[PDB]
C-alpha cells in the first residue's frame, strides 16, 4: 500500500464515536465490543502483548513509544508489590478532544481494553484518571463500569476467565500537568501533580509505589479490537512504523471542525479537506497548521501542502503527530498572538517544580507578549530561540520542551512577521 487515508467504516475501531448509537453495554456488544473477552484473557498475557507488537501500536498519547514494548516492560515476575495499570484520561493538550469522545460514547470499549491490558501485564486493578471537568463523561464511564461489574465482565472471575480485575475512576481537579504520566501517578497518590524524575521508571515504581503502566485512552481502547481482528489488521493501515488508525481532532479555522477516525499516514491536506470541508476561505487562505495538539511545532502551508499525518513524516517536518489535534490557522490569524496564547497556557499550567520550566516558561511568555505588541528588537528573537533551547532537554517533564517547541516553530517559520511587527511598532513611536 502506497496511498493511505482511505479508511472504511468496516475498519473503524470506534463505531459509536459520534454517539449515534447506544453507549451502554447493549450497544457496545451489538457493535462487537466485549466479544469473547474470556478467550482473549485466557489466550495469555504474552499472546496479547505479541498481538499488540504485531499491530505496531504506538503511543496515542503523543509520545509515540511502541505500545507493545511499553506494556511488555511490566510482563515480569511479580516483585511482591501489587501491580497496577493507569489509563490516562486527562486529555489536557489544547486541541485534543478525542479521549473525551471515546469515554463518553464508547466507555465499554475502554473498559474491555483495561481488562485485556491488565491481563496482559498482570495488573491487580486499573485506575482511570479522568479530567475533573469531564464530569458527565466520568458519570458515563462509571455507569459502564457498574454494568460490567453486574454482568461479570469485570471484577472477580472477570468474563468467567478467573482473572480478578477492577476498574477505578479517579476524577482530576483541573491541572494540565496531570496529563504527564508520573504527575498523574502523584496526583492519584494524593500529592501535588508534580512529575517524578525517571529513573525509577513507572514500570518499576509507579502508583502507590507499585509497578504501574500509564496508557492513553485510545491506546487502551484499541487493544481489544487489535486482539480480535488480529495485529495484521491494525498493521495493514498506515505505513511501516506508523501503522494503525488515529483519531484526528481537526479544529480551528476549518469549515467543519470535527473528530474523525482516519488511517495513519494520511495526507494532511486530504484529511483537512476530506472531512473538515477544507480551510475556511479555501486552501490558499491557510496560514499554518499545528498537527499535534499544541506541543508539536507548527508547519507552514508550504510543508502542509504535501505531508503525511504520521509520526515519522511529521518528525521530518520538524513537528510530530502527537495527539493528532490539527489546529488550522487561516491567514486572518495573528500567528504571534496564537503562539503567545499557547505559551500563556503553558505558563498557567506549569507545575513550577523544575527551575527551567518554572522561570523560563514565564520569561518566554513575557517576551512573546512583547513580540505580539512588537515592543522588542530583532536580536531578541535569537535570544528567545536560545531561551527555548535552554528550557528544552533540561526539564523534569516534557511540558517545558512542549512549550519551547511552539516558540521554535514560530521563529523558524514566521520570523519575518515578528521583525516586521517590531519595525511597525518602532515607526509608531
Amino acid at each position: 500500500k502506497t496511498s493511505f487515508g482511505s479508511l472504511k467504516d468496516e475498519d473503524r475501531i470506534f463505531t459509536n464515536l459520534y454517539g449515534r448509537h447506544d453507549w451502554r453495554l447493549k450497544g457496545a456488544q451489538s457493535r462487537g465490543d466485549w466479544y469473547k473477552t474470556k478467550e482473549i484473557l485466557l489466550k495469555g498475557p504474552d499472546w496479547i502483548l505479541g498481538e499488540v507488537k504485531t499491530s505496531g501500536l504506538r503511543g496515542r498519547g503523543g509520545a509515540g513509544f511502541p505500545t507493545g514494548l511499553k506494556w511488555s516492560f511490566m510482563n515480569k515476575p511479580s516483585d511482591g508489590r501489587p501491580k497496577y495499570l493507569v489509563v490516562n484520561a486527562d486529555e489536557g493538550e489544547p486541541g485534543t478532544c478525542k479521549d473525551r469522545e471515546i469515554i463518553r460514547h464508547d466507555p465499554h470499549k475502554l473498559v474491555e481494553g483495561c481488562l485485556v491490558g491488565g491481563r496482559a501485564m498482570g495488573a491487580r486493578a486499573a485506575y482511570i484518571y479522568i479530567r475533573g471537568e469531564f464530569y458527565n463523561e466520568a458519570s458515563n464511564l462509571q455507569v459502564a463500569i457498574r454494568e460490567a461489574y453486574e454482568a461479570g465482565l469485570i471484577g472477580k472471575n472477570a468474563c468467567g476467565s478467573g482473572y480478578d480485575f477492577d476498574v477505578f475512576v479517579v476524577r482530576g481537579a483541573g491541572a494540565y500537568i496531570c496529563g504527564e504520566e508520573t504527575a498523574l501517578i502523584e496526583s492519584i497518590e494524593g500529592k501535588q501533580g508534580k512529575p517524578r524524575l525517571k529513573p525509577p521508571f513507572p514500570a518499576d515504581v509507579g502508583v502507590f509505589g507499585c509497578p504501574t503502566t500509564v496508557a492513553n485512552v485510545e491506546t487502551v481502547a484499541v487493544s481489544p479490537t487489535i486482539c480480535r481482528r488480529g495485529g495484521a489488521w491494525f498493521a495493514s493501515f498506515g505505513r511501516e512504523r506508523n501503522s494503525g488508525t488515529k483519531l484526528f481532532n481537526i479544529s480551528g479555522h476549518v469549515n467543519h471542525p470535527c473528530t474523525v477516525e482516519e488511517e495513519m499516514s494520511v495526507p494532511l491536506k486530504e484529511l483537512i479537506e476530506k472531512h473538515a470541508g477544507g480551510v475556511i476561505g479555501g486552501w490558499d487562505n491557510l496560514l499554518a497548521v499545528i498537527p499535534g495538539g499544541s506541543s508539536t511545532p507548527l508547519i507552514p502551508k508550504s510543508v502542509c501542502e504535501t505531508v503525511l499525518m504520521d509520526f515519522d513524516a511529521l518528525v521530518q517536518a520538524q513537528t510530530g503527530l502527537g495527539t493528532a489535534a490539527v489546529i488550522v490557522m487561516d491567514r486572518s490569524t495573528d500567528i504571534v498572538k496564537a503562539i503567545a496564547r499557547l505559551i500563556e497556557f503553558y505558563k498557567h499550567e506549569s507545575c513550577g517544580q523544575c527551575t527551567p520550566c518554572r522561570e523560563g516558561v514565564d520569561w518566554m511568555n513575557k517576551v512573546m507578549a512583547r513580540f505580539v505588541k512588537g515592543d522588542a528588537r530583532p536580536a531578541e528573537i535569537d535570544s528567545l530561540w536560545e531561551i527555548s533551547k535552554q528550557i528544552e532537554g533540561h526539564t523534569i517533564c516534557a511540558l517545558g520542551d512542549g512549550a519551547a517547541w511552539p516558540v521554535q516553530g514560530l521563529i523558524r517559520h514566521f520570523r519575518p512577521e515578528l521583525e516586521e511587527r517590531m519595525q511597525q511598532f518602532a515607526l509608531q513611536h
Binding site: 463518553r104 491487580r124 458527565n136 458519570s139 462509571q142 457498574r146 461489574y149 471484577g155 502507590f208
Partner: protein, 35 residues
C-alpha cells in the same frame, strides 16, 4: 443523551454502589507510612 440527568453526587453515588462489587484491597503493612 442522559448526561442532563447526572446531578452533583452522581459520580460519588455510583462509586458507593460499586463498593460492593469491589474486592479486598492490598495492605502496605502499616496504617500509614507515617506510622
Amino acid at each position: 443523551l442522559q448526561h442532563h440527568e447526572y446531578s452533583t453526587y452522581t459520580f460519588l453515588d455510583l462509586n458507593v454502589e460499586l463498593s460492593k462489587f469491589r474486592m479486598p484491597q492490598p495492605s502496605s503493612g502499616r496504617q500509614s507510612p507515617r506510622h
